[PDB]
Amino acid sequence: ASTSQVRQNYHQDSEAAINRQINLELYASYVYLSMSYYFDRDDVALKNFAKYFLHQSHEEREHAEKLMKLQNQRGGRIFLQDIKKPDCDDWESGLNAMECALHLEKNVNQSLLELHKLATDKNDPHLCDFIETHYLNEQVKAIKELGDHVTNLRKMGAPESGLAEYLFDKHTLG
Amino acid sequence: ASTSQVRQNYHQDSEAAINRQINLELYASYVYLSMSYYFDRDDVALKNFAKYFLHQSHEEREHAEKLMKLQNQRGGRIFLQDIKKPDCDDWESGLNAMECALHLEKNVNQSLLELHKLATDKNDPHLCDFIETHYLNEQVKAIKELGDHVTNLRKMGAPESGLAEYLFDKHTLG
Amino acid sequence: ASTSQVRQNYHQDSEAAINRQINLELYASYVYLSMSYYFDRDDVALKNFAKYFLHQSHEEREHAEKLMKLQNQRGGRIFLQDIKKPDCDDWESGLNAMECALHLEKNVNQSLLELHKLATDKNDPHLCDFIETHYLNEQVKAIKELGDHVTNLRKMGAPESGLAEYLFDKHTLG
Amino acid sequence: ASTSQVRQNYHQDSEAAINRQINLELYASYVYLSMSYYFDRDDVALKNFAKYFLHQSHEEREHAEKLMKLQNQRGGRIFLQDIKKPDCDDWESGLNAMECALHLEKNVNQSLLELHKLATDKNDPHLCDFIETHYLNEQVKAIKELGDHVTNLRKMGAPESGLAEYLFDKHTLG
Amino acid sequence: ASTSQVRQNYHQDSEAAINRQINLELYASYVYLSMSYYFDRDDVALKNFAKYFLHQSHEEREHAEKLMKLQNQRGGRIFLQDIKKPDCDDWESGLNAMECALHLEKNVNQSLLELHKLATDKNDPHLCDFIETHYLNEQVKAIKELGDHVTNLRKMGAPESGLAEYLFDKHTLG
Amino acid sequence: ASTSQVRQNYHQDSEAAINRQINLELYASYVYLSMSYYFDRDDVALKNFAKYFLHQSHEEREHAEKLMKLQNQRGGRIFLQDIKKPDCDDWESGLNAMECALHLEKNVNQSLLELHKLATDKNDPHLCDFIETHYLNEQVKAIKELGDHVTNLRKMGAPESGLAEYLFDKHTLG
Numbered sequence A, B, C, D, E, F: 001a002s003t004s005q006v007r008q009n010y011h012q013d014s015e016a017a018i019n020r021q022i023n024l025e026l027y028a029s030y031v032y033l034s035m036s037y038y039f040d041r042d043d044v045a046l047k048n049f050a051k052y053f054l055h056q057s058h059e060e061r062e063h064a065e066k067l068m069k070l071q072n073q074r075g076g077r078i079f080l081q082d083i084k085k086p087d088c089d090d091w092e093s094g095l096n097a098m099e100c101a102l103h104l105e106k107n108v109n110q111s112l113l114e115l116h117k118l119a120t121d122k123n124d125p126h127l128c129d130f131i132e133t134h135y136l137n138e139q140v141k142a143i144k145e146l147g148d149h150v151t152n153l154r155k156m157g158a159p160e161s162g163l164a165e166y167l168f169d170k171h172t173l174g
């Protein structure tokens, strides 16, 4: 029950919001793992889509680990929950997967912006700086990259053009 | 519905048993992630326990990825489920965590032995060879290592001796 | 007539089944040699299809040589038969050749699975291990690769699109 | 039916004679493969005889591939036939195998000389030059080498002397 | 009395069969040590026979050590017995020693095949894989090598020809 | 029956005493092999004790081989006997194993001193020099090292202190 010897200026609500964000990052890791192996199917067979999303999956696990480290640095206590299976429809196509990833990374961003508003409301400048330094620009860059990919696939003629997704796989993802 | 162009000698029951094993490997990854950050707490502070279990966590993710690759190689279809939160009590001590890891790795082994018995019953020698080559000896070595660690911690006087867990952290895990 | 000084636990039926497999591997070598030089024709002119199938042809010769080595290791006697000319229709297109190779590599796999069932029935664990180690996963990987190639050529618009086969030749086979 | 865009000065009879030579080179490859694994038997056990004939086997496959390349260069169409199993008696001894190889390489030479006489009769100087450059001196050197080997084995006391074949294996073939 | 914390799917009969195999491997080590120093006698004086059998002796000790490691990995308990002195007649000649080694390595193989049949009967796929991976192909290669050596010594004129054994010592064993 | 051409000043009693010493060195090798794998058990788990005694085991085999070489150098005839299984009680602890090794190495020394007294009585200065050069100081150093190890384990609180044996394993044996 009694207080961590390190804890200072770290609100219980911030502690709980960090636990929720840990779960969301692990969920995002799981979504990208599912998307990766869709592209490894013999009836999809886009190997650079598969490698792109597997790298994105490993990056989300790193994002979760850094928040776990933060929770202990500040003297909070990690509380884990089930990692839900990916909730998105049939992956369908390279374009549809990229659109689902864009939606995922905007939802993660909205969670981080809510977390920053809480840390601001609780006058926790260390936590605000942590979120800004390690998360907010990463999300802005991830969202911009996924928007660019969606735009190129649309302009090339995906998802009806299997030639489009094949050539995008080689020239952008390769 | 209709059959993968690659599928040959791969029973629906084997396909489903591989999906169950994927989930178990992801669960084991999650248990070791939880155990790792327990040792990173300021009131536990055993950094080489933390690094040992984080490495074990990354190895279980690799184990899951290789089964996902196998499912697609054989023309089965990956089906994911929720990854349950770790089910073990309060982690308590270095000795208790090592005993929980031993129990986890014996349960994983029992699942793999059931999977091998199914593959044998369905006359699937490729799947039997896959399990033998990539999983069964890894489990035997993991179980032996964890037994050795439990034995040393017990002999040194854990968990009552905090000096025991400290010196094990430096000399065996360091 | 009298028995090889090395022979032990090696059934006459296994000896004969190995001779049949030697012939099948040499036949597969011959099919891929024919397919390779089809793509070297001035009215087909896909040089990386030609190199891919010539490499596959040399690999099948290696597969045959290793079974010849096994026959002598176990004290059986090699018996050769005619290598039949390739039995497949006009090669027609890059897609049709890839579909014929997929069919060839699944027929070779079925022969190896029958050979493994015989070795299992005759309690020959050395022969079972030989087939598992050197043949079964090679076939699974070959079949998965050819399925992936067929899928990409179909999605790109082959065989009606000569642009599809040209670009596949450069980006996947090159 | 209609004519290759590359074809010039290439008679239908030359085209057919090249297809026959392709088959003969593949047959020679097969004879030397059989001879090689005879020397790998546990009751023959002459490892450098085995390696010598396996190298000769790979060289005949190269000889066949170069004629396949020539057929396409000139705008003819490859037509394959069954590769007959080796027609020679029991291999018996190192000396007998070397005498069978000498007979094989003289029969191949006679085929090439007939092919050159046809190319001369059809005023095809490119084909005459191809045969001279890549085949005729290779055959003369192969025949001379095999004659030398037969002579040494005879002088040493083969095939009655197993010591002769053993020492030839180490000093000439090693 | 009570059970090893590591033991899983490891039958008491398999445990005892592994102890018997340990003894057999140490016995084989001892036979080859005796054979080695026979060839080091001043009235035999074949130094490369001596080095060949001493290497074979050290390899059998490694074979025994790996089974001791396996027994502990699986949570069985090593039980040692006397290592009997070599049971073979006067070593007599290089040919006779090679024939005794062939007989030794076929008896070791038969023991391993019985051990594999037991592990199969007890549904122990880890133990089956261990025997296949580390022992069965090693025995097949050892038996084939010794058959080849016996064949060459016989063909050269051993054991009546001391020149045969001398030249085999230099060219095959050197 | 008749005399080795090399034999000079080598008494039949010395020849027999060397055969007895060969057996004792092989016995010592076997004792240390048993002790090594005791420390590899999952319920003992002292890896540097295991490596120390395995090295000691390989050194005793070298000691036996050098005496076998000596027997042939002097024109005696090696006569082997069964290698008895280790005769020591349950190994129990690191301290008890070290005390058993001290007792083993003093018994080996006493045998060598008896062998030297015989060689002195038979006026065999070559054999006296061989024993002095290759055995007597090795035994003195081995006995002193084992006494030092026993002393440290006793002073640290073994065998009741499992922490003592653990820390000795890392700092002296590591």
Ligand SMILES: [Cl-]
Residues within 6 Å of the ligand: A007, A008, A009, A010, A011
């Ligand atoms: Cl606070």
Ligand SMILES: [Cl-]
Residues within 6 Å of the ligand: A010, A011, A012, A013
């Ligand atoms: Cl608070």
Ligand SMILES: [Cl-]
Residues within 6 Å of the ligand: A080, A081, A082, B085
């Ligand atoms: Cl939960």
Ligand SMILES: [Cl-]
Residues within 6 Å of the ligand: none
């Ligand atoms: Cl829900």
Ligand SMILES: [Cl-]
Residues within 6 Å of the ligand: A119, A120, A122, A123, A124, A125, A128
């Ligand atoms: Cl603030």
Ligand SMILES: [Cl-]
Residues within 6 Å of the ligand: A133, A137, A138
């Ligand atoms: Cl950034």
Ligand SMILES: [Cl-]
Residues within 6 Å of the ligand: A137, A141
């Ligand atoms: Cl930026």
Ligand SMILES: [Cl-]
Residues within 6 Å of the ligand: A141, A144, A145
């Ligand atoms: Cl950007």
Ligand SMILES: [Cl-]
Residues within 6 Å of the ligand: B007, B008, B009, B010, B011
């Ligand atoms: Cl199927």
Ligand SMILES: [Cl-]
Residues within 6 Å of the ligand: B010, B011, B012, B013
């Ligand atoms: Cl099914």
Ligand SMILES: [Cl-]
Residues within 6 Å of the ligand: A085, B080, B081, B082
């Ligand atoms: Cl679910």
Ligand SMILES: [Cl-]
Residues within 6 Å of the ligand: none
């Ligand atoms: Cl539940």
Ligand SMILES: [Cl-]
Residues within 6 Å of the ligand: B119, B120, B122, B123, B124, B125, B128, C120
């Ligand atoms: Cl099976």
Ligand SMILES: [Cl-]
Residues within 6 Å of the ligand: B133, B137, B138
């Ligand atoms: Cl392994």
Ligand SMILES: [Cl-]
Residues within 6 Å of the ligand: B137, B141
């Ligand atoms: Cl291992």
Ligand SMILES: [Cl-]
Residues within 6 Å of the ligand: B141, B144, B145, E073
């Ligand atoms: Cl281990």
